[PDB]
Amino acid sequence: FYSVEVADSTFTVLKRYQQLKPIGSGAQGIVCAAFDTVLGINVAVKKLSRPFQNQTHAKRAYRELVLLKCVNHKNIISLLNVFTPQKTLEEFQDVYLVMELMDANLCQVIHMELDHERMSYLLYQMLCGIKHLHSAGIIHRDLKPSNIVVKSDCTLKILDFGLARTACTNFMMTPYVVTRYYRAPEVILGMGYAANVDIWSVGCIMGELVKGCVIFQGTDHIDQWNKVIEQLGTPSAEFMAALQPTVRNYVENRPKYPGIKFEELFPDWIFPSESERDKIKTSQARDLLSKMLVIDPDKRISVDEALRHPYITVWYDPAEAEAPPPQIYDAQLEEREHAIEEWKELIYKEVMDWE
Ligand SMILES: Nc1ncnc2c1ncn2[C@@H]1O[C@H](COP(=O)(O)O)[C@@H](O)[C@H]1O
């Protein structure tokens, strides 16, 4: 049934998957492209190495498997197959996920000088995917260019389900976060977060697609806050006064900034302006950016409002088939506490349930 091929690590896969070649790298290792001789299509192949090795990674892997299966939305990456080459629960080591194959992540698209039609279409698809997650009870919290993928026909999919809400303990730990440029400021302000944490990330991604550089590029929390207030301005006295004392004192002690008007921050001449239509769309794009890149989450636009925005809603087709809300058969998907051996069996059964 199987054959082993070495990319930078060895991949042991079903014979139907041929010509494996690395297309990217992440926390779970190498992702390969492959040709599925049985389907006749190209696919992506991801290997999860001993995902049950610890409680943190086990819970994350189990959640991803359950959600990838249950969710079926055109802007969330599709799971096509799941398998393990090992023959018993005891010998079980590795899980292989087979996904639909896309052409690039959004990091590549930032340099591609997109026009209003392509930019708004990508943003519409992103917001559709986020809306579907939110309707399923999932706030993503870690959207960024590298976990959003696109095809050359401008179709777009969100690659993963983000970060579950979890209390960090000595044994449920937090992977270190490398890329922090897209995370809303209420987190580092100690405020906690709501669903429109994801809207801030979309605002940051949209800004980068338009400008070609990272909007808020800080080296740590202190630097990140400075880069936010230098561009958007010091938030209101009432907002600052509602912060916890140490944070409040710090942010009230910073130099004050008026904020750069969005007409100066995102000026007409970095957008298309050939036609009268282009000039209307530029105003609309800037209006949407000014409603997403808002420090105070109580004043930031919602996903539902963003989808209705004139820049975005041109792409809504009432004749298109809607996606049904997922039916997540495991209700206690976040309330799970298990020893390693129990996680291993839970994950194994999920994998076998596919065969
Ligand atoms: N299904 C896929 N299609 C295309 N590229 C992918 C796919 N999955 C992952 N990638 C690429 O691999 C990188 C790392 O993936 P990941 O660590 O799983 O988020 C991404 O930023 C993409 O460039």
Integer Cα distance of 226 and 216 in angstroms: 9
- The tokens of 240 are what? 């600052």
Candidate from 17, 23, 205 with most ligand 1 atoms within 8 A of CB, to mutate: 23
Please return the burial class of 156, using the count of CB atoms within 10 Å of its CB with bins 0-12, 13-18 and 19+.
buried
- Report how this structure was experimentally obtained: X-ray
Alpha helices in the chain (DSSP H): 55-70, 106-109, 116-135, 185-188, 197-211, 221-232, 237-241, 245-253, 262-265, 276-292, 303-308, 340-352
Judge whether 254 and 234 are in contact, CB under 8 Å.
yes
Candidate from 42, 96, 97, 105 with most ligand 1 atoms within 8 A of CB, to mutate: 105
Residue corresponding to tokens 């209003």? 116
Task: Name every residue whose Cβ is closer than 8 Å to that of residue 16 and which is 6 or more positions away in sequence.
Answer: 36, 37, 38, 39
Judge whether 318 and 46 are in contact, CB under 8 Å.
no
How far, in Å, from the CA of 56 to the mean position of ligand 1? 21
Integer Cα distance of 262 and 256 in angstroms: 18
Q: Is 31 annotated in some ligand binding site?
A: yes
Q: Is 46 annotated in some ligand binding site?
A: yes
Which residues, listed in sequence order, are joined to residue 30 by a DSSP beta bridge?
25
Nearest CA to ligand 1 atom 12: 24
Candidate from 35, 149, 182 with most ligand 1 atoms within 8 A of CB, to mutate: 149
Task: Name every residue whose Cβ is closer than 8 Å to that of residue 317 and which is 6 or more positions away in sequence.
Answer: none
Catalytic residue (one of 8, 36, 115, 142): 142
How far, in Å, from the CA of 260 to the mean position of ligand 1? 35
Say what the resolution is, in angstroms. 1.7
- The tokens of 29 are what? 């290792």
- The tokens of 37 are what? 């001789």
Of 86, 1, 103, 102, residue with least CA distance to 47: 86
CA dihedral 159, 164, 169, 170 (to 10 degrees): -20
Judge whether 82 and 97 are in contact, CB under 8 Å.
yes
Integer Cα distance of 251 and 141 in angstroms: 23
- The tokens of 339 are what? 């020893």
Judge whether 285 and 306 are in contact, CB under 8 Å.
no
Q: Is 139 annotated in some ligand binding site?
A: no
Q: Which CATH superfamily hosts domain 104-315?
A: Transferase(Phosphotransferase) domain 1 (1.10.510.10)
How far, in Å, from the CA of 351 to the mean position of ligand 1? 21
Residue 201 backbone dihedrals phi, psi, to 5 degrees: -60, -40
Q: Does the annotation count 268 as an active-site position?
A: no
Nearest CA to ligand 1 atom 4: 102
Q: Is 25 annotated in some ligand binding site?
A: yes
How far, in Å, from the CA of 159 to the mean position of ligand 1? 7
